[PDB]
RNA sequence: CUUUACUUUGAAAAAAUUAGAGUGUUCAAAGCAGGCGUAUUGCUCGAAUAUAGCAUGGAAUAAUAGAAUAGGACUUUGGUUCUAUUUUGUUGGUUUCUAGGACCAUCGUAAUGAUUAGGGACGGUCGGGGGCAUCGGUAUUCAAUUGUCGAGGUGAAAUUCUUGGAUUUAUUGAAGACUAACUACUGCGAAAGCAUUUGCCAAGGACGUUUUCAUUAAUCAAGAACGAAAGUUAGGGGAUCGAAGAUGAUCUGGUACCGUCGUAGUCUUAACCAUAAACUAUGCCGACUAGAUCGGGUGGUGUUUUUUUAAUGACCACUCGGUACCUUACGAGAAAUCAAAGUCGGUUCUGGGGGGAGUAUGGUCGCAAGGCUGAAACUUAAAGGAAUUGACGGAAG
């Protein structure tokens, strides 16, 4: 469930497809894809109707380089983040980490704004 | 009974002495029972309200 | 022959979805394989074949078990049936 | 800072609408906030504690018993008596509020995004999965009898078998093993493994509308059970071919290939040892990514089969599971190639140069051959994989 899931998103923008066609809906889907709206990543979403659970809907352009998880959800700190940002994005600058934070799942770098630890979910970049 | 039989075959005995001093034991697990029957006074509350709830919508 | 089996156990009828059904349908023709078992003793896969569905006892035994034995439906199970 | 809001109920013909009530409790201190000097109340800040009711428990209300606290009337001042309040135990009507037990439906939308994840019941269906008990056919061999005179082997040969009638041809009788064809680019079993036909006990998978318990699940050191062939023990059986053993031939030699015979084995019950270059040289389980064949279920208002018309079909559309497999783009890799052995997680096993070594020794198992676990001294400077060129063949064209 974790590990299927950025990959089928990352898959529909190596070959360009323009919205990806993903579906499941309970209570840790959504929010860090708004954090993706704001960062400029990703484009817009609804939902539509299913017989049971959901169906997302999501809207490409061709940003993703490579996401993933990281499978184990390790303890960040605020101060060591960046031991993780090291590996986990090649590159500096471009990327973010997305931390669940203790203040919901945001960024990792709004995440030192607030001051605030909590495990990790995956990389954008 | 066949719990003194069952105290000879594993044995807690030895001789004559301690064999008619066990009958006590046994005889204290029907107590627990009466413990348990205490419980159908809950039935006999949910009666009554059965009672008051047809007193009201008639 | 299933159907005479299913009225015995359950709360209503139809449901061997009620798991203890299982319980009781793999220990009773178990022993009646094993009549198949006092037979002969060369007999290749039908003792292969009895490990699986015998050992599926133990894992029906592992069931109802780590879920909800608040009164244990699990020592119910295995007293009617006879297992462990 | 901020409400529109949310909800249980009444009055309304319905209904707009309207009327009333609610949206935690307790304690100490400090700050700000109505009316007053204050007190005190409300809110906020911080803690502690708990998070559907009507069997049960608490409070309100009533009674009774004990204890504590406050006030009054009395007192031969110890105490008694009355009243109020709190707490504990017990009982009853009514009002209000809190724990606990059994069983069942649905999967709605906001926090990792095209998700039915585990067990079956019901009803149809396929298969060489298993064990036992029967039965049939062909071929071979042996025994008896008829018609008829030499054969068998090989590169040539001989051992060998025949006038005491062989090979053989037919008839009759017996004993054991195996099931040609069908037979496949087929199916089943978790793997080992599974081919005549029929009957009984008995297991698993896949499909279909659904019905249904509601994380019950995944994986798993140890541990437990199962085990092709070869070998061992005890009792049977020995047709068809034969390790060991005995002759003939071949050669420089021939303890072999070849030919004539033949022992243990090969078959069977029970018990044991438990291994294979035990294989897909690729662990199990779940989600993402273009293209065959076999089984199930549905459709083909059209055509054909055909006289219990069941054609199960023909031939075409799909939709699912197994998926001999073939072939291939993206992509990966040292490359051949793969089509995941690309790539991902949860969990378990395993590798750290060659020789010495699966050995030495101990432990453990075994009836015994032997299995399992398992090193070092020392030696050495490489062992090894993928891919190329050319010579050669008692290789082919």
């Not at chain 1, 996401?67 to 590996?87: H, L, Q």
């Not at chain 2, 009466?34 to 039935?43: D, M």
């Not at chain 2, 509350?45 to 009201?56: K, L």
Request: with cysteine.
């Amino acid at each position: 469930l974790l590990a299927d899931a950025l990959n089928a998103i990352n898959n529909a923008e190596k070959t360009g497809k323009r919205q990806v066609l993903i579906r499941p809906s309970s209570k840790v889907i959504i929010k860090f894809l708004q954090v993706m709206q704001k960062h400029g990543y990703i484009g817009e979403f609804e939902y539509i109707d299913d017989h049971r659970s959901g169906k997302i809907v999501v809207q490409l352009n061709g940003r993703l380089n490579k996401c993933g998880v990281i499978s184990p959800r390790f303890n960040v700190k605020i101060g060591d983040i960046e031991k993780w940002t090291a590996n986990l994005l090649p590159a500096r600058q471009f990327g973010y980490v997305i931390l669940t934070t203790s203040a919901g799942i945001m960024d990792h770098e709004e995440a030192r704004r607030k001051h605030v630890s909590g495990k990790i979910l995956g990389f954008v970049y | 009974y066949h719990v003194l039989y069952k105290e000879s075959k594993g044995n807690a005995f030895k001789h004559k002495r301690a064999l008619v001093e066990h009958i006590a034991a046994a005889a204290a697990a029907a107590a627990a029972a009466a413990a348990a029957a205490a419980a159908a006074a809950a039935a006999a509350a949910a009666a009554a309200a059965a009672a008051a709830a047809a007193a009201a919508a008639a | 022959i299933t159907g005479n089996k299913i009225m015995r156990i359950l709360k209503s009828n139809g449901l061997a979805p009620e798991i203890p059904e299982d319980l009781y349908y793999l220990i009773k023709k178990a022993v009646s394989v094993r009549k198949h078992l006092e037979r002969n003793r060369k007999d290749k896969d039908a003792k292969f074949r009895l490990i699986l569905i015998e050992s599926r006892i133990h894992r029906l035994a592992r069931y109802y078990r780590t879920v909800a034995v608040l009164p244990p439906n699990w020592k119910y199970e295995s007293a009617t049936a006879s297992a462990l």
